C-alpha cells in the first residue's frame, strides 16, 4: 500500500503538470494539422463517453451492493443475485490444471500449444499454483468480482476527472479566458 499510494501520487503529478503544459506551453498555431490539436476540436465527444462509463459502472456496482445488503437483511442470502467472474476464473484455468475438461487453456498436456515450451519450467508452475497455502493466483468469486467492478468504476471516474481538468484548461463555455490567467 506504500508503493500503491505513491503510484497514485505520481499519476496525479503527471496529469497536473500535463494541465500546466497545456496552459503555459501549448500553442495551437504550431501543432496544427496533427492528431493532438484535432483532439480538443472534438474532445467533447470523449468527455461524453467517459461520463457515460462513470454512470454505468455505478448504477450496477452499487446497485448490486444495495440489493445484496437488502436481501441478506431479509434473511434470504440465496435470493441475492450473486455474480461469478468467469473471466477471472479463466485465469485459474491458465495455471495448467489438467482436470478441468471444458476446452480451456492449459487443460490438457497433449495440446501442441501446451506442449510448446513445457519442457523445463512448467513442472514447477503446475506444482506451485495447485495449492491453497500460497498466493500465486488465488481463488476468485463474487466478493472478488464486485470489488473489481467497483475498482473499475472508481478508476474510470478518476480518469475522466484527471483528463477534463487538463482539457478545459485554456477555456470553456463557462470561461473561455481561462488561459489568460
Amino acid at each position: 500500500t506504500h508503493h500503491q499510494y505513491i503510484a497514485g501520487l505520481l499519476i496525479v503529478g503527471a496529469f497536473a503538470h500535463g494541465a500546466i503544459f497545456f496552459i503555459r506551453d501549448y500553442d495551437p498555431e504550431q501543432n496544427q494539422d496533427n492528431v493532438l490539436a484535432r483532439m480538443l476540436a472534438h474532445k467533447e465527444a470523449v468527455i461524453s463517453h467517459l461520463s457515460w462509463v462513470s454512470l454505468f459502472l455505478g448504477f450496477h456496482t452499487l446497485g448490486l451492493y444495495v440489493h445484496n445488503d437488502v436481501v441478506v437483511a431479509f434473511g434470504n442470502p440465496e435470493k441475492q443475485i450473486l455474480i461469478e467472474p468467469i473471466f477471472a476464473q479463466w485465469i485459474q484455468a491458465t495455471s495448467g490444471k489438467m482436470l478441468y475438461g471444458f476446452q480451456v487453456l492449459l487443460s490438457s498436456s497433449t495440446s501442441n500449444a501446451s506442449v510448446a515450451a513445457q519442457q523445463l519450467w512448467l513442472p514447477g508452475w503446475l506444482e506451485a499454483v495447485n495449492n491453497e497455502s500460497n498466493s500465486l493466483f488465488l481463488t476468485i468469486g463474487p466478493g472478488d468480482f464486485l470489488v473489481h467492478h467497483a475498482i473499475a468504476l472508481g478508476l474510470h471516474t478518476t480518469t475522466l476527472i484527471l483528463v477534463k481538468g487538463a482539457l478545459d484548461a485554456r477555456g470553456s463555455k463557462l470561461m473561455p479566458d481561462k488561459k489568460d490567467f
Binding site: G171, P176, D177, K179, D180
Partner: protein, 124 residues
Amino acid sequence: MPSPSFLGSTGGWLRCAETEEKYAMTWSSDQQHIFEMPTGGAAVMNSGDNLLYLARKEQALALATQLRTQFKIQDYKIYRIFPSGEVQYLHPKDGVLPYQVNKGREQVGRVKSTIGKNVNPAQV
C-alpha cells in the same frame, strides 16, 4: 465642522487608522435627518456639511451611494495620503462617473481580440 454624533466606540482610537490613510466625506444636509453609518448603528444628521473619518475606500463610496438614493444631493469625498497629502480622488472631473463628461482619457486599455492576447501594444 458639525458632524453627526455616534456612540459605541469601535471605529475611533485605532492605531492602524492613525498610521494608515483615512477618508473624509461630506454632504449638504439641508434638513435635520437621521441616518445609519455603513459600520455603525443610527445617528442624527445635522445641517450643513458634515466631516467624518473612514478607514476603507468601499466604506467611502457605499455611503455616497446610499445618500444619493435618499434625496438628491451632490457628494464630495476627499482621500488623504499617509503624511498630510490631501488629494481629490472622488470626482476629479466634478462630473458624475456614470454620466458623460467632456474631460475624456484612456488608462490601461488594450484594444485586441476577446479570447486573449494579453500583450499590450501601448500603455499610453
